[PDB]
Design an enzyme around this catalytic site. Sequence first.
Site, short mmCIF file in Angstrom:
data_model
loop_
_atom_site.label_atom_id
_atom_site.label_comp_id
_atom_site.label_asym_id
_atom_site.label_seq_id
_atom_site.Cartn_x
_atom_site.Cartn_y
_atom_site.Cartn_z
N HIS A 152 1.59 3.87 2.10
CA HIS A 152 2.24 4.50 3.22
C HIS A 152 3.75 4.31 3.20
CE1 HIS A 152 -1.79 4.40 5.62
NE2 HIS A 152 -1.69 5.47 4.87
N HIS A 180 -7.22 -1.40 5.96
CA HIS A 180 -6.33 -0.40 6.54
C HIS A 180 -6.18 0.80 5.62
CE1 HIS A 180 -2.63 1.31 8.23
NE2 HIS A 180 -2.10 1.18 7.03
N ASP A 224 5.87 3.18 5.29
CA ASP A 224 6.45 1.89 5.69
C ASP A 224 6.49 0.86 4.59
OD1 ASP A 224 3.64 1.76 5.98
OD2 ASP A 224 3.83 0.12 7.45
N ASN A 267 -3.63 4.28 13.73
CA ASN A 267 -4.02 5.39 12.90
C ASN A 267 -4.88 4.79 11.80
OD1 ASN A 267 -4.13 7.58 11.19
ND2 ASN A 267 -1.91 7.91 11.15
N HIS A 327 0.85 -1.19 0.00
CA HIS A 327 0.00 0.00 0.00
C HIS A 327 0.89 1.25 0.00
CE1 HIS A 327 0.25 -0.36 4.48
NE2 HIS A 327 -0.08 0.91 4.54
O1 LIG Z 1 -0.78 1.10 11.18
C1 LIG Z 1 -0.08 0.93 10.12
O2 LIG Z 1 0.18 -0.20 9.70
C2 LIG Z 1 0.45 2.10 9.32
S1 LIG Z 1 1.30 1.91 7.88
C3 LIG Z 1 0.25 3.46 9.96
C4 LIG Z 1 0.65 4.68 9.16
C5 LIG Z 1 -0.30 5.53 8.62
CL1 LIG Z 1 -1.98 5.18 8.88
C6 LIG Z 1 0.08 6.63 7.88
C7 LIG Z 1 1.41 6.90 7.72
C8 LIG Z 1 2.36 6.07 8.27
CL2 LIG Z 1 4.06 6.42 8.03
C9 LIG Z 1 2.00 4.97 9.01
CL3 LIG Z 1 3.22 3.98 9.75
ZN LIG Z 2 -0.33 1.91 6.31
ZN LIG Z 3 1.90 -0.28 8.37
#
Ligand SMILES: O=C(O)/C(S)=C/c1c(Cl)ccc(Cl)c1Cl
Ligand SMILES: [Zn+2]
Ligand SMILES: [Zn+2]
Length: 231
Positions: A85, A148, A87, A179, A83
Amino acid sequence: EYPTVSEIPVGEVRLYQIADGVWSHIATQSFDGAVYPSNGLIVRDGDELLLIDTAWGAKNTAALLAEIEKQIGLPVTRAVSTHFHDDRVGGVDVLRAAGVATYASPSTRRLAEVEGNEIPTHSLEGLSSSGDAVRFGPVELFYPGAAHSTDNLVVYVPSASVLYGGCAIYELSRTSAGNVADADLAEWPTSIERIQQHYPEAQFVIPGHGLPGGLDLLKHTTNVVKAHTNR
Ligand SMILES: O=C(O)/C(S)=C/c1c(Cl)ccc(Cl)c1Cl
Ligand SMILES: [Zn+2]
Ligand SMILES: [Zn+2]
């Protein structure tokens, strides 16, 4: 025995062998004064490797490539981001500079661009509708529906019965929704049920963050999401 935060300093990456020719990669990132772990996957495909997700940032992803070279010694020729984001795609420019072909669905590429994140080069067709699956080398890619994120993919390794749920699947020790700014809470349980229906034989289930387990992680995630929904 699976590595935790306390065992992985900022900027280092660990590999964990899950089954023959399948590893997770584990890294950490600090934000808001806390430290978080993150997982991706490495799958052998003959004499080359397929990478699933970056190691959450350029520095970590450079360390990941160096650890792969040291420990496994086969070339990473392709990488898929599951996805948009950071990470999952943070580090794509490092992969690209190193000659790794980077891939994501057109949905992920679009959302990464809107977010100002790094953008995988290649677009994966055939994943636009919930329930769609495509083969990609030694893995199956599956779009279970929004969860997510609206774009989240899952990855299955049929030779090893390994299901990589990515961030749509929570580890057991995670009891509150993180989040969910980009989530579809309304659809997430239905998307989880699609994963269960498609991969009932999975023996190993890897979340995007934290400890692997079995298919119990799916119902666990549903419970957490539903509790959050009712908050
Ligand atoms: O809970 C999760 O797996 C992720 S990827 C949380 C997140 C979101 Cl929602 C936005 C931005 C970023 Cl950097 C991260 Cl880490
Ligand atoms: Zn994410
Ligand atoms: Zn994540």
